[PDB]
Symmetry: D2
Subunit: 123 residues, 4 copies
């Protein structure tokens, strides 16, 4: 993929969380996520996808991934999805918006979903 | 997983799109998506995660998945993430909210991301 | 406004909440909201804006409004914004997506904002 | 209102847009918005609401507002809502997430709504 090398590695967001990803040639993303906040401890599995043949006109590279917040330590009964774009160069970034959905009863489902935004850097 | 059997299979949303997923015991989701709308044709790879040990108190099952909108036919230079919950029973549903991010230039990045909501049924 | 008459009146969403609005010629929206759910009781002030000269090509009419969830009875320390479009005709609707922000400490601000979607009808 | 004085005035976001607001004692927000981006020129009317009696525990102040993107110069057939919180102190900020809805045909309504985030400062 054009940015396979650029995306693969360890990223950090403004909260202090750590995103560890491998980009495959075909568009896969696999890795681990460790949140600095919330009902979370240690690493969680992630998977996702990215555009392995982006535009050559200076546009970013679209991608996304999911974490279900269950591991051997905790289960928050929740999942987050991040949707965003990789922007390459000396100050590389992944700019995302995310959706965190809790399992709820039907009566509470109106209040099931948090929205926010994370920016990941290599430093 | 508690809902491995409930989630695995073919789902359809209010647009007429078709979501084909396999749920693994461990929390994986793998499959294909075919959109009835947008800059899309035929099937695209998806991956995601779900809570394989949900609450037993009538709450839904949190899950999410991604599609990068590249296949052998088209490349929209975009990715969607769906975040939601599976609700089991005679009228099973997956209720989601989604985020569709386009690769953009930095000048247009304010306008990179669409938000919406899809409800999937087995019929 | 083109839809001043169509928008003005009493609307109900899928939760059972009641939206009472007056549309002004100039684009204003003023009224009251009464939620069927959440940390809310009785009516709350709303204000917002709508496109008073929409496209004539069958497109909906863009609009939005806010409620801060303080009245004489309760204060949730929160505000919701609905962003959407009015679609006229025998089955008129307002289709919206909303953002509910809580006041939080800086440590909890990542979790400050809920997202959802409401559809309002005249019946 | 507790933050009537703190909110009232001229704010600027990371795009260079200019938000000019007056906060009323009762919870009103009135003013003008001028966007540095998009299908916009000059000032547009805004209205909204804020929590005029916030928590005293260091939490921010919830608020929101709307702009319909029609004025004497242009009509984008769209509306944005910002939902967020005011945080007072030497570095005051308004942190928001927003929803920009376009009027669309029913066939294109899935793609009607952009989501993003703006941070406003006094400098
Ligand atoms: O509390 C939970 O339900 C599980 C932890 C969620 C942490 C969220 S995911 C979005 C944001 N970005 C992070 O790095 N952490 C929070
Ligand atoms: O146009 C694109 O960029 C690729 C197709 C996007 C189709 C979207 S994904 C969200 C919504 N749900 C669907 O089933 N289709 C649309
Ligand atoms: O709980 C709160 O903070 C105040 C009540 C919020 C009720 C929300 S606003 C979005 C959704 N639509 C409704 O009609 N009610 C809920
Ligand atoms: O293009 C349009 O439909 C009207 C202009 C929209 C400008 C948006 S509103 C959200 C973001 N914040 C800004 O200051 N400008 C853009």
């Amino acid at each position: 993929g054009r940015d396979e090398a650029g995306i693969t590695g360890t990223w950090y967001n403004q909260l202090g969380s750590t995103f560890i990803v491998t980009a495959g040639a075909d568009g896969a993303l696999t890795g681990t996520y460790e949140s600095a906040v919330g009902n979370a401890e240690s690493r969680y599995v992630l998977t996702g996808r990215y555009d392995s043949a982006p535009a050559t006109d200076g546009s970013g590279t679209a991608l996304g991934w999911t974490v279900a917040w269950k591991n051997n330590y905790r289960n928050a009964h929740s999942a987050t999805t991040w949707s965003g774009q990789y922007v390459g160069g000396a100050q590389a970034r992944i700019n995302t918006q995310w959706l965190l959905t809790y399992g709820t009863t039907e009566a509470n489902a109106w209040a099931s979903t948090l929205v926010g935004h994370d920016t990941f850097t290599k430093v």
